[PDB]
Structures are given as structure tokens and as C-alpha cells.
Amino acid sequence: IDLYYAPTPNGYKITLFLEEVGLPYTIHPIDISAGDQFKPEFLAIAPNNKIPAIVDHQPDGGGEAISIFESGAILLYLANKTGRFLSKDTRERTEQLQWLFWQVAGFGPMLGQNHHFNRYAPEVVPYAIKRYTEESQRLYKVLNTQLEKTPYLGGNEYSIADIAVYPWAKCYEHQKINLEDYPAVKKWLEKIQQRPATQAAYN
Amino acid sequence: IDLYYAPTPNGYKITLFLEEVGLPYTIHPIDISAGDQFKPEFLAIAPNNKIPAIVDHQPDGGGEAISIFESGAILLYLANKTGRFLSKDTRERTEQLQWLFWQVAGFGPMLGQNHHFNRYAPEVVPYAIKRYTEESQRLYKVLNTQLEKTPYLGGNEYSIADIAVYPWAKCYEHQKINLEDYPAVKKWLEKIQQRPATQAAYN
Numbered sequence: 049i050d051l052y053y054a055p056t057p058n059g060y061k062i063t064l065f066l067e068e069v070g071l072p073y074t075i076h077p078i079d080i081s082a083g084d085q086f087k088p089e090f091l092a093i094a095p096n097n098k099i100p101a102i103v104d105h106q107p108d109g110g111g112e113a114i115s116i117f118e119s120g121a122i123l124l125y126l127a128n129k130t131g132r133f134l135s136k137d138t139r140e141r142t143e144q145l146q147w148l149f150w151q152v153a154g155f156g157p158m159l160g161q162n163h164h165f166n167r168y169a170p171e172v173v174p175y176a177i178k179r180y181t182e183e184s185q186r187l188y189k190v191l192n193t194q195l196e197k198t199p200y201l202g203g204n205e206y207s208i209a210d211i212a213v214y215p216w217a218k219c220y221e222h223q224k225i226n227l228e229d230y231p232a233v234k235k236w237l238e239k240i241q242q243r244p245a246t247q248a249a250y251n
Numbered sequence: 252i253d254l255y256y257a258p259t260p261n262g263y264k265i266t267l268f269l270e271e272v273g274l275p276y277t278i279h280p281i282d283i284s285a286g287d288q289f290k291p292e293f294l295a296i297a298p299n300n301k302i303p304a305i306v307d308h309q310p311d312g313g314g315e316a317i318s319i320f321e322s323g324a325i326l327l328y329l330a331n332k333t334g335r336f337l338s339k340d341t342r343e344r345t346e347q348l349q350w351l352f353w354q355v356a357g358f359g360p361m362l363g364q365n366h367h368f369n370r371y372a373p374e375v376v377p378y379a380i381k382r383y384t385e386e387s388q389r390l391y392k393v394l395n396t397q398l399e400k401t402p403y404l405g406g407n408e409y410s411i412a413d414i415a416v417y418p419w420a421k422c423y424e425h426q427k428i429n430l431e432d433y434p435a436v437k438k439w440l441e442k443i444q445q446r447p448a449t450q451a452a453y454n
């Protein structure tokens with residue numbers, strides 16, 4: 049597995065997964081501050097100009113390498129290939145995938161806008177900062193509400209849903225989120241932080 | 252299938268799919284202007300307070316009903332259940348799913364911010380409107396570039412990737428997008444508009 053990577057929340061999703069399974073991989077660093085993500089060779093693999101992306105040179109089918117962009121798609125592909133971190137039971141699987149989709153469609157995109165507008169003086173973008181601050185709070189509340197019910201996000205076991213959420217939730221301080229308002233999220237963060245693969249990916 | 256629905260881009264994704272397959276469904280209208288999405292009975296099904304959501308009372312397993320929120324998760328679940336609009340070949344499937352994820356994580360979320368900031372006088376939110384206008388252009392360019400290469404989004408056949416994108420791309424005028432800049436997108440919109448299920452869902 050070739051992983052096109054930068055040390056960002058979306059990059060860490062994939063190294064978390066790979067470190068949990070112990071699947072060999074080669075990191076191809078993409079310097080997103082340098083614009084490496086716009087180079088033609090990268091766009092061939094990842095036409096949306098974003099990391100992460102992978103190339104699997106040993107697809108189950110044999111044959112041509114398979115390239116994939118979108119962290120959610122990569123997680124699903126790898127979970128299917130390895131049979132790890134995603135249930136094969138339709139009910140459990142569907143719950144896990146619902147929360148994966150919730151992460152890629154809402155948690156990541158909106159917290160990312162929160163990150164973006166924190167690059168401005170607040171007085172300069174008052175409507176935007178209010179919008180994304182309030183939405184960040186709503187998202188953490190949704191997350192906390194689920195984690196009050198189940199030990200992991202939509203289930204009894206660590207899954208790709210949790211792997212997708214963790215690198216974003218780990219950044220709560222940058223999002224100006226008061227984690228004391230979300231005690232179940234706090235305990236879940238603490239729990240995932242103790243996993244050796246988490247420490248390895250963030251080393 | 253019970254579908255919790257409003258006539259919005261994300262709602263139409265699901266009625267497009269159901270109309271293509273001819274799977275019976277019951278619409279449960281959720282008046283999102285009235286705040287129906289915050290009612291406890293709805294939150295039980297869709298804790299993120301958004302439509303669409305479904306309840307499948309006849310899951311393959313038999314047994315308890317399965318509830319699902321997130322349009323991407325619903326599309327995947329229904330495509331798997333029916334065996335329609337998503338390939339069973341690993342390569343084709345992976346390409347389709349990559350583009351599904353791209354839609355739910357980027358195309359929808361960012362065009363939705365474009366929609367939101369068009370509710371303001373432009374002089375009042377100059378940074379936000381510029382950001383989401385430029386991002387909308389980037390997204391249409393990515394879409395157009397792919398549709399120059401393949402007749403449908405990541406493939407030779409209409410799939411859940413196309414179904415996910417269409418209701419958002421159909422709204423280009425509202426996004427202040429000049430569709431003449433994206434001729435492949437224009438032809439693809441025209442093509443999908445001719446499908447009887449498209450007309451049915453939008454009737």
C-alpha cells in the first residue's frame with residue numbers, strides 16, 4: 049500500500065487504520081503547504097487535489113493497481129480487504145457506516161470551516177465564526193449523545209467510524225470547544241488515546 | 252421502506268434511487284422549516300436532526316427494523332440490498348464509492364455553504380462568499396474533468412455516485428455557477444434529466 053499523506057486529521061485516519069492492522073505501507077509525503085497536491089502525478093491518483101489517497105498495488109483481483117482518494121472510501125476499502133474494523137453483520141455494519149458517513153459529511157467538513165475561520169480576527173468574520181462555532185457545538189453534542197449510549201460510535205467495538213472521528217475530535221482545543229460540556233466524548237478520546245496504534249500513528 | 256423526507260437536494264437523492272428501482276416506499280414528510288427534525292420521535296431515527304433517513308421494516312436478516320440516516324449510507328445500504336446502481340466488481344465499485352464519498356464530503360457540504368451565504372447581502376459577508384464561490388468553482392471543475400473522461404461519474408453506467416451528485420448540480424443557478432464553463436457537466440445534467448425516474452422524483 050502506497051499512502052499519499054500529510055500529518056493532518058484526514059491523513060491520520062489512514063495511518064491509524066494501517067497501524068491497527070499492521071498492514072505494510074509506504075508513506076509518500078505530500079507537502080500541502082508547497083502545493084504538491086496540484087502536481088499532475090498526484091492529480092492522476094487524486095483528482096480532487098487532497099490527501100489522503102492510496103494506491104494498492106496488490107488488489108485482491110490481481111491486475112492493475114487500484115488508486116483511491118477520500119478518507120471514507122479508503123477506510124471502507126481497507127476494512128473490506130482486511131476484514132477488520134467493520135462488522136460483517138448487516139445491522140452492526142450499517143450503524144458503523146452511518147456514523148462514518150456522518151463524520152465525512154458533517155464532522156470533518158464543518159470543523160474544518162471552524163479551523164479556517166480561526167485564521168482570521170473574529171471581528172472581521174463575525175457571521176462565519178458564529179455559524180461554525182455553533183455548528184461545532186451541535187456536532188459535539190450529537191457525538192456525545194451517541195457515546196452516552198454505546199461505548200464506541202454506533203457500536204460495541206472500535207471501528208472505522210471511531211477512526212474517522214478521532215483525529216478531528218482530538219483537535220477540540222483548536223476548535224475552541226469546551227470538552228467539559230461533552231463528558232462522554234472526553235472519556236472516549238481518553239480511551240482511544242491509550243491504544244498503542246494511536247500512539248504509533250501520532251509518533 | 253419508510254422515507255423521512257423534504258424536497259431538498261439530499262431528499263431527492265433517495266427518491267431518485269427508489270424511483271429508479273421501483274422499490275415501494277412511504278413518504279413521511281419532515282417540515283424542516285417547522286423544526287420537525289428536532290422532535291424526539293425523529294431524533295430516535297436520525298440523531299443528527301437531518302433528512303433523509305429511512306426505516307427498513309423488512310431487512311434481509313428478518314428481525315428488528317433498521318433505521319439509517321446520512322444520504323450516503325442510505326444509498327449504499329439500498330444499493331447493496333437491491334443489487335442495483337453499484338457494481339459488484341471491486342474496481343468499478345471502488346471508483347463509484349470514491350465519487351460517492353467525494354459528493355457527501357465535499358460537493359454537498361461546500362455547495363450548501365454557498366447556498367447559505369447567498370442568503371446575505373454580499374457586502375456583509377465578503378470573505379465567506381468569496382471562499383465558497385471559489386470552492387464551488389473548484390468542485391465543478393473537478394466534476395467536469397472526470398465527466399470528460401467517463402460518461403458517468405467514475406464509470407460507464409449510472410450509479411449511486413451520479414444519483415448523489417445530480418440533485419446538487421441541478422442547483423447550479425442558485426450557486427451562481429456558470430454552467431457554460433463546465434460543458435461536460437452540462438451534457439451530463441441534460442442526460443440525467445431525460446431519465447424517467449428523474450422526472451418522477453421531481454414531479
Ligand SMILES: N[C@@H](CCC(=O)N[C@@H](CS)C(=O)NCC(=O)O)C(=O)O
Nearest residue numbers: 056058080098099100118119120356
Ligand atoms: N473529504 C476529504 C477531505 C480531505 C482533506 O480535506 N485534505 C486536506 C488535508 S486534511 C488537503 O489535502 N487539503 C489540500 C488542499 O485543499 O489544497 C477526505 O475525507 O479525504
Ligand SMILES: N[C@@H](CCC(=O)N[C@@H](CS)C(=O)NCC(=O)O)C(=O)O
Nearest residue numbers: 056057058152156157160161164356
Ligand atoms: N483549501 C483548504 C485547505 C485547508 C484544509 O485542507 N483543511 C482540511 C483539514 S487539514 C479540512 O478542513 N478538511 C475538511 C474535511 O475533512 O472534510 C481550505 O481552505 O480549507
Ligand SMILES: N[C@@H](CCC(=O)N[C@@H](CS)C(=O)NCC(=O)O)C(=O)O
Nearest residue numbers: 153259261283301302303321322323
Ligand atoms: N450529510 C447529510 C446532509 C443532510 C442535510 O443537510 N439535510 C438537510 C436538508 S437537505 C436538513 O435536514 N437540514 C435540517 C437542519 O439542519 O436542521 C446527508 O447527506 O444526508
Ligand SMILES: N[C@@H](CCC(=O)N[C@@H](CS)C(=O)NCC(=O)O)C(=O)O
Nearest residue numbers: 153259260261355359360363364367
Ligand atoms: N442548518 C442548515 C440548514 C440548511 C440546510 O440544511 N442545507 C442543506 C441543503 S438543504 C445543506 O447544506 N446540506 C449540506 C450537505 O448536504 O452536506 C444550515 O444552516 O445550513
Ligand SMILES: [Cl-]
Nearest residue numbers: 124128327331
Ligand atoms: Cl460495502
